[PDB]
Amino acid sequence: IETVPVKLKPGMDGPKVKQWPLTEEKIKALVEICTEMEKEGKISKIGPENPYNTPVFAIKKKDSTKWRKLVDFRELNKRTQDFWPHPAGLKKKKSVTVLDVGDAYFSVPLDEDFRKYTAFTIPSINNETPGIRYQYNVLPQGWKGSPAIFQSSMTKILEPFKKQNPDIVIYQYMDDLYVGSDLEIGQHRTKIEELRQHLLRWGLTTPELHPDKTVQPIVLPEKDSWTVNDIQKLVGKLNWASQIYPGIKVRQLSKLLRGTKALTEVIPLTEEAELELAENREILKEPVHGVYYDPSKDLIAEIQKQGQGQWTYQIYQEPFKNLKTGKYARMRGAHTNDVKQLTEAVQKITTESIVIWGKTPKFKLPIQKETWETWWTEYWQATWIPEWEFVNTPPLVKLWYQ
Amino acid sequence: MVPISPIETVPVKLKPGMDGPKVKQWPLTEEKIKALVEICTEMEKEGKISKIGPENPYNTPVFAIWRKLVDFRELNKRTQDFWEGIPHPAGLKKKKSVTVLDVGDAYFSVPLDEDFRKYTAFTIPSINNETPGIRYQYNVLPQGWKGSPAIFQSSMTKILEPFAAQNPDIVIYQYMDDLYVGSDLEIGQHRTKIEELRQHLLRWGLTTPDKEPPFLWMGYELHPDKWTVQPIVLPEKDSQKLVGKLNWASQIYPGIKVRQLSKIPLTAELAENREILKEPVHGVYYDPSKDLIAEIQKQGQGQWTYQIYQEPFKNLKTGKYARMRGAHTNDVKQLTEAVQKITTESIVIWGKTPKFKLPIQKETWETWWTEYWQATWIPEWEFVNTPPLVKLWYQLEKEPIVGAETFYVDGAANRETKLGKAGYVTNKGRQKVVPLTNTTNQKTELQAIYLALQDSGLEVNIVTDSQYALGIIQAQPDKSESELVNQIIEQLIKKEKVYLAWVPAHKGIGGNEQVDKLV
Ligand SMILES: C=CC(=O)N(C)CCOc1ccc(Cl)c(Oc2cc(Cl)cc(C#N)c2)c1
Structure with a gap:
């Protein structure tokens, strides 16, 4: 009935984010959706005196054949004052x-002075006509203040x-x-x-959601016959795990690798080496020491493509202190499309992260910026959007999570 | 008198914390003043301006060239921002x-917000400065104002x-x-x-x-059936403008190349470019009933050219793509990036993704994306058999090779002397150490792998502890800035099977001969 006072953060102006190109079917869907919202009073046309802008696009949620409008309010959310x-x-x-x-x-009106900051533009094909410009009158979807x-x-x-x-x-x-x-x-x-x-x-x-069985254990092979290569990869993995777990030792296993042997030659394990393997196994069964969550710091999510529709991920705040690791292997209409798989994995990891901590992580995506930025909106189905950055150098550690 | 509908004014305000302009009027000559007075009188008789009293404390300078030129640079600096x-x-x-x-x-028929008119005030100086100058403010959007x-x-x-x-x-x-x-x-x-x-x-x-x-608009010519760039003529000279005009011509003239001229006379002369930039070429207009097609060719040196069309040989437009500046690269990555650019440009211009025709085999693309460590994707496309074809130049093994000699490699260098060594020891007792001057740890780690490639058979297992070398080769480059990397690439092309394994250094893994390399 009465709009709540709302303001931006000190020293910050409203968002001025470029609208990215939309396909003709998405433009038509937004035109129909926005024409209807205007009639319902949820949005209103605005004039050239409004300089702000937030990108808009269209999606289709799961099990629905109806277009839906999604506003990328990420910039406004960052600049919007924290709400007590x-x-x-x-x-x-x-x-x-x-x-x-x-x-x-939408049943709740928005503070008149703030509305100008929700401006968005339905773009035109080929810059022919000017963009249809609107601002919100009611609380908008995807705004953090809503x-x-x-x-x-x-x-x-x-x-x-609840009672x-x-x-x-x-x-x-x-x-x-x-x-x-x-x-x-x-x-x-x-x-x-x-x-x-x-x-x-x-x-x-x-x-539908059910918790996972939190940090998946690091597991070592159990073989009756180790080649030189098997033992080299074991020592590599144990060396890596030693950055996470204290007393991992590789001396006895490395001693077997002494001499310059053929990679496919079978090496029998000494009894000192089998004990060292067993001590490392036991170490790996216990949890990582001193792993807590700090709400002041950001969550970081790393994703690796393992092939055949399998994806590994780790969420953490400090390196080697994983708060959550996982493996996503479902290809839903995606067995031929890596980017669709990655986009669905980012949405599942974000949902997991909302349940556990009530905030989204910052993703490190195994993908080139220009490919990701061209395609992810085609497969996006959630009303929120997290932050991401791009890894262009192949992590050595990919298989140690496989 | 037929009643005219009023044009709603746009509320305008100044930037926050900034006040209106106060610029001193420049001294004018007697004939200039007379000229301005006649102009402003007709403008006032037309409603464009209005005389104001002396309460208004704002002023913008005016000039004559007659024509009145009001210099609103200062008011523009203080006017709010507008949607572009x-x-x-x-x-x-x-x-x-x-x-x-x-x-x-x-x-001149679009009114200006009342509360903002006062900021547009300007003064005509009087003859011999013996009376107060005439004071006017605008009632319509001034030509030259920021928001007009x-x-x-x-x-x-x-x-x-x-x-x-x-x-x-x-x-x-x-x-x-x-x-x-x-x-x-x-x-x-x-x-x-x-x-x-x-x-x-x-x-x-x-x-x-x-x-x-034909219409002449934004550097184009628009005819009832064709369009083309406004006439572009390559220049004849003995001793940037050629870049811009070729970049401008590239959108219709297929095969423009700009790398060496984008790279102070030198050679370039390709830089003729006249062959086409002398014969006239035109693009067609868009027909939404027909499919949209984009075709790419590799031109060499990181250069790519493309045509977008709906019927064969009648191009809507053309373009080029240049490799991104990097240390290592390969052809598939470049072709992927070109696809992404043409995809976004087409969505801008036609609101849909074109169907692609690409010089890469379907099997080459499948091998690539299933084994590439990044996620990657190109939209619907079909192979077109226009050489040079993009191909994979080598593929590393996933498992060690049985019967293939195992080369343990290492390199090391002294930070001060720039002296180092590279070499290998193998399971057959083969061994080599080469001494090197003016080198680094990174270069010796590459050189050690290079030596193993040169001195091994068609199938070979190679064991390194260089995280740096594995980082490069796992990116699967087919070309580099470094001649070392390019020599490794050339050796990898000649092998039949290469298995590259990484071990951690200084952990006692045998063959890992840091001692020979650090001698
Ligand atoms: C009869 C001509 C014709 O069919 N032609 C030119 C091709 C299609 O071209 C069009 C069609 C419709 C309009 Cl309304 C248009 O008008 C414009 C557009 C632009 Cl972007 C610039 C100018 C100018 N200066 C004129 C051109």
């Missing part, structure tokens, strides 16, 4: 369901359902509700429908 | 008729929006003080619709009088 909690138990729940609650924000503002009304719609089901953990990140239950799968599917119906009673309209 | 990409002719769609209209009278182009085009666009919506069968393009209207209707109906547009512009009090293709 994360549940540690959502990660521990047996199952967690993710609900798009984006339409709820859940912060709507939060008071969200607690009001939740408290009835009725107190074993349900509920969490809100951007345009999504994360609802976790320790119940059985049939018990979950029903309660989520009950929560959506409860939302629909308050006017809210809502159009 | 030109069409490409190969994107235009042919029309049976295209009419041009003059809307220059509307520029953006506010003007924006005001016209709002005016034409209903007309373009009620007439989907025509097309309107705004450029400078002229409007371009085209359609595919019969010459009768098309001239009718032009009269409706003049009627519609009269509802805002805009007068249009009552160019002839």
Whole structure:
């Protein structure tokens, strides 16, 4: 009813981000979507006195054949003033369901002075006509201040359902509700429908996740016959692991490699070497020492392409102190397209990271900037977008995660 | 008196914390002052300016050349920012008729925000400076003010929006003080619709009088059936401008090359370029009913050329791509990058990705992307058999080779003396150490691998501890800046099977002969 006061950070101006080129079908979808939002009053045409801009594009979520508008509010989010909690138990729940609650924000007006900062441009093919320029009147999807503002009304719609089901953990990140239950799968599917119906009673309209078994162990081969090459790779992996785990030792194993032998020759292990291997195995079973999470520091996610649709990743804040490692091997309409696979892996790792820590990591992508920047929007399906950078030098460590 | 619809003004404000301009008026001559007074009197009689009292404390200088020139550089420095990409002719769609209209009278018919007029004040000095100068402020967008182009085009666009919506069968393009209207209707109906547009512009009090293709626009020539760059003639000289004009010509003239001239007389002469830059070439216009095709050729030295077309031999446009500046590279990476650029340019100009025709075999591309450590992708494409074909020049083994000699290599160098050594020991007892001057650890680690490649059979296993060397070879270059790397590449091309294994240094792995190399 009454707009909440909102301002930018001190010394910062509104965003002025270039709109990137869209295909004709995406432009037409945005034209139809935006024409409808104008009629509903959610956006309004603006004039040349507004210099700000945020990129816009279009997507199709999963199991839907309807175009959807996504605004890349990353710059505005960075420049938007911090707004004055994360549940540690959502990660521990047996199952967690993710609900798009984006339409709820549109029922809330936006502070008139701030609207100019939500400006965006539907572009024209071939720069023929001028871009259609709009700004938001209501809380926009993907703005960080939209859940912060709507939060008071969200607690009001939740408290009835929450009192009725107190074993349900509920969490809100951007345009999504994360609802976790320790119940059985049939018990979950029903309660989520009950929560959506409860939302629909308050006017809210809502159009699968289970925790992994956190840091995957480093494992060493078990062979009856080691070649020279087998033992060279073992020593390489053990040397690498020694940066992470204290008492890894390679002396007895390296001693076998003494002399200049053929790479395919079988070397029998001495009894001192088998014990050293066994001591290193035991070391590797224990956890890394002194691994904590610091909410002041950024999360960093590294991804390696392992081939055949397999991808490894590690999340960490400090090198060799992994908070989470994983392996994504699903090719969903992607077995011929690396970039689609990478884009889906980035979205899964980001979701994992939202559940565990309630914020997105900074990705280090095994891909050239120009290829990634040309294609990722074609396969994007989430309402948030994380940050990324590009690795152009092949990490030696790729196989040690394979 | 027919009531004219008012043109809504655009609210304008100055930059935050900045006040209006206060520049001192330059002393003028007596005839200049008389000239300015006549001009401003007719402008005032027309509404463009208005006399102001002395409360207004702002001033912008004025000059005469008559013509009045108000120098708004200072007010522009203090005016807010405004929302600011030109069409490409190969994107235009042919029309049976295209009419041009003059809307220059509307520029001086777009009002200026009232609260901002005071900032536009200017003073005509008086004769012999014995009276107070005449004081005027603008009521319309001053030519030369910062916001005039953006506010003007924006005001016209709002005016034409209903007309373009009620007439989907025509097309309107705004450029400078002229409007371009085209359609595919019969010459009768098309001239009718032009009269409706003049009627519609009269509802805002805009007068249009009552160019002839080819149009000359932004360095192009636009004909009813073809387009081309405005005539480009290569220069004849004995002793940058040739770069820009060739880059400009490259968009239509296929095969322009600019590397050595992009690289102070020298040679270049390719730099003739006349062969084509002397015969006349034209591109066609876009037909949305036909498919869109892009074809790339390798030209050598990191250079690539491409044509975009819909029917064979009638190009919409052409272009080139230059390798990115780097230390190592290969042809597939370059071709990939060229594909990405043509992809983005095509989405700009036609709103879709072209179908690609590429000089690479399907099997070559599959081997590449399945084994490349990065993710990579090119959109739908088919092989075209136009030499030189892009190919993989070597492929390292995944497993050690049985029966192939194992070379343990190492190099090392002294930071002060620049003296080092490179060499190998193998399982057959073969051995070599070469002494080197003016070298580094990095170069000796490469040279050791090179020696093993030179002195081994067609199949060989090589063991190094150089993370630096593995970093380079795992990038799969086919060409380098370093002649060492290029010699390793040339050796790798001649082998049948190469297996490269890495071990950690100074951990007691045998054969890893840091002692011979550090002697
Ligand atoms: C009859 C001509 C024709 O069919 N031609 C030129 C090719 C298609 O070309 C068009 C079509 C429609 C318009 Cl409305 C247009 O008008 C413009 C566009 C631009 Cl980008 C610049 C100028 C100028 N200065 C005029 C050209």
